[PDB]
Ligand binder design. Structure first.
Ligand code: ADP
Ligand code: ADP
Ligand code: MG
Ligand code: MG
Lengths: 371, 7, 90, 371, 7
């Protein structure tokens, strides 16, 4: 039987069977409910739409993300996401196949506990493992020594991993993520009088970000150009047909990854957290990391972010280093791909916790393997 | 409706 | 120039070393040659001691580490369950 | 005129006139700058704040320590700490009283010049001296021989002081201290779902470390008890009124002082660096030292730390050497206390570098001493 | 807000 691989991303759920080269199910991790009383009873409405359903019916629903910064905040909402993942999106009985769960680094013990409990007892999975997302990210490029800079909708994190072993004390988390950049995008679009408030409107702003924002290579000269010619500014049209112009705002939004001060976060920028994790690594190995900075997760998709990460972390490194930013295509779903790779293998076939083990030993098996 | 798009 | 040290309180450690020096000089006066030869001896012995204290207190840690490490590449104590089970990738 | 005694600690600056048995000023050595714009211009708001003003204003400031690990990082920030010490904390003109500065052993020779030059040329001190911290500690403890284990916010220092002299060859500077220990508390709190990131938030964690945390006499026995019963669990509520619930974390943090492995530190633990220091001595003085183990500086305060230190170092020493731990109260301040005594000696009143001596010799006064 | 005491 083929194990099931699920990337529990904060914004989108990527899932499939082991050995697929790309995820089968790729959908926004949304649970919806209706904002108004239902009146055409002959329609036969259902009380909570999920995934692409909620995104289809958008403006009659309140939209809930159950995962905030990797923390599962609402469990019955997340349980419905997994129910839909299994019975509808993949069409499989999860009690008959082993399951691979991705998880974010430095995420509290209880999240793994409740994930475990729900898998082993709501879905009765037969065997299971929970992988540190960055491991899978590095593995996805086929390399086995580097530092990963992961940056999803909910978490940005830096993990050094050498000869395939992680450095746990040298990990960093920064919660400034894709949602936060959507937040700041609202605020700056408000300057040109484009207000967006409802969750539905939030999704419009997410769409806008995903197609007109880009990482400026040279912020000062760019912003001087933006104050000198309209040629850097362009437009997009709403689901309401009307056009909206995105301008200075284009670059100002993604600039925040390097300047978290712009969202009033004192926390260091992504170039600083990568550097500050390399400098937490043992003095020997820093070279091996500089040739192997791998980017992963969807907010690493901004045009020019690689160029900026390079030209920035260049300044943080000493001169005479091969500072090479590994930013391929498929970085989008890389984490999942790595899951599928690792899942296919007899060595990893030792790692999966048997349901029976958990059943007999309680949470005491997972309380170890979470490190 | 007061703003440009949006309300 | 040569140095030898031995310690044996419970186990044993030994230091053994040489340096060889070649130079060229010019001859002027009895006082000046006296001073000059001494200046060379002074310089050579003080640099030789300076290296053998200041370099060896740091660089020998790094080369001895390159022969066997104090903590692993992970900077963590190894874990027997994961070490038995996980033949981690090439 | 009476002398002024100043302790340039990593975390808190302890200061006051000589002969006194408690310092007149005790404050966190912080320069705190604005995080945000001062819109209410009528406040008379400051370019930076210091000490208890910064700690009151915590929520709006970027808190920078000018000393990190043990070295001054930015001279003008330290200079502000000193200016504030004189004019605000003590309300005195530094031109008018002799001054003593504490200093750490093996601090590079140029630092002595910078401190000296600032104290004469910025602050016009009428006389000056610079002292090895650790000496003052034993001196304050009365005894004329022993091994110090001094640990504040930045450096753990071990010195065997014999016939009233530091023995320089035996001095084991250890980069593990209070600040480093604070970081690890952040992580073990994270396990249970509490988060803290901003440099303001760091100082909140410091408050917790100084209250709930303690040293267990034997690690897994305690931990097994804690894993069995919630009896070992206590609480402390943040400025925002929510209680934190804490058990297993309480002994786990300061365990690190015995296990630098927990933080990936290559250097040995606190008992270890003490032993490792003792063994370097002239062999005849070994027993003179073992009866004379002296603890000091703020990190030495944790309940059970002395009893643990005894059971720990007893393993390392050959038995029947009668190892004894001097750890009464007031050891929070032994270092500054020592200087206050030293500055009361009539011989020392002759021995200061005078203002007139520096005004003829400049910083070259130290070149006879520094080799 | 996610976090138990922080976000
Ligand atoms: N073309 C794009 N440019 C910038 N950001 C993007 C782009 N496409 C997707 N994203 C961001 O990727 C984030 C989610 O990526 P992903 O890692 O797949 O989901 P999750 O973060 O939940 O695991 C979203 O917040 C979205 O803003
Ligand atoms: N009662 C206590 N419990 C735990 N930690 C303490 C206590 N008192 C002081 N400390 C720690 O000691 C550190 C500073 O020690 P101290 O030597 O007074 O400062 P410095 O070395 O900068 O002079 C602080 O970071 C503080 O966390
Ligand atoms: Mg993700
Ligand atoms: Mg101190």
């Amino acid at each position: 039987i083929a194990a099931l691989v699920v990337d529990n991303g904060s914004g989108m759920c990527k899932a499939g069977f082991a050995g697929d080269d790309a995820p089968r199910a790729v959908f926004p991790s949304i649970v919806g409910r209706p904002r108004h009383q239902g009146v055409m009873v002959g329609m036969g409405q259902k009380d909570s739409y999920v995934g692409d359903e909620a995104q289809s019916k958008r403006g009659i629903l309140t939209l809930k993300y159950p995962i905030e910064h990797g923390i599962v905040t609402n469990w019955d909402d997340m349980e419905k996401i997994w129910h839909h993942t299994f019975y509808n999106e993949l069409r499989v009985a999860p009690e008959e196949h082993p399951v691979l769960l991705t998880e974010a680094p430095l995420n509290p013990k209880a999240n793994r506990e409740k994930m475990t409990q729900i898998m082993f007892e709501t879905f009765n999975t037969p065997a299971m493992y929970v992988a540190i997302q960055a491991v899978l990210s590095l593995y996805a490029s086929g390399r086995t020594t580097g530092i990963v800079m992961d940056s999803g909708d909910g978490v940005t994190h830096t993990v050094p991993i050498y000869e395939g072993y992680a450095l746990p004390h040298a990990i960093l988390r920064l919660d400034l993520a894709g949602r936060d950049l959507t937040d700041y995008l609202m605020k700056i679009l408000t300057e040109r009088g484009y207000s967006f408030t409802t969750t539905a409107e939030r999704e419009i702003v997410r769409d806008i970000k995903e197609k007109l924002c880009y990482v400026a290579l040279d912020f000062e000269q760019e912003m001087a150009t933006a104050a000198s010619s309209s040629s850097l500014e362009k437009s997009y049209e709403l689901p309401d047909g009307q056009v909206i112009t995105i301008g200075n705002e284009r670059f100002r939004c993604p600039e925040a990854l390097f300047q978290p001060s712009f969202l009033g976060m004192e926390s260091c920028g992504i170039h600083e957290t990568t550097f500050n994790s390399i400098m937490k690594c043992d003095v020997d190995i820093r070279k091996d990391l500089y040739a192997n900075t791998v980017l992963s997760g969807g907010t690493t998709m901004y045009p020019g972010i690689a160029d900026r990460m390079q030209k920035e972390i260049t300044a943080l490194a000493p001169s005479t280093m091969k500072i090479k930013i590994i930013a391929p295509p498929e970085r989008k779903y890389s984490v999942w791909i790595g899951g599928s790779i690792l899942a296919s293998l007899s060595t990893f076939q030792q790692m999966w916790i048997s349901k029976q083990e958990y059943d007999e030993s309680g949470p005491s098996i997972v309380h170890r393997k979470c490190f | 409706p007061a703003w440009x798009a949006x309300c | 120039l040569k140095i030898q040290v031995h310690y044996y309180e419970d186990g044993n450690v030994q230091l053994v070393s040489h340096k060889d020096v070649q130079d060229s000089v010019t001859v002027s006066n009895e006082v000046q040659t006296t001073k000059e030869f001494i200046k060379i001896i002074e310089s050579a012995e003080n640099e030789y001691q300076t290296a053998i204290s200041e370099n060896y207190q740091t660089m020998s840690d790094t080369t001895f580490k390159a022969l066997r490490r104090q903590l692993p590449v992970t900077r963590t104590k190894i874990d027997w369950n994961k070490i038995l089970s996980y033949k981690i990738g090439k």
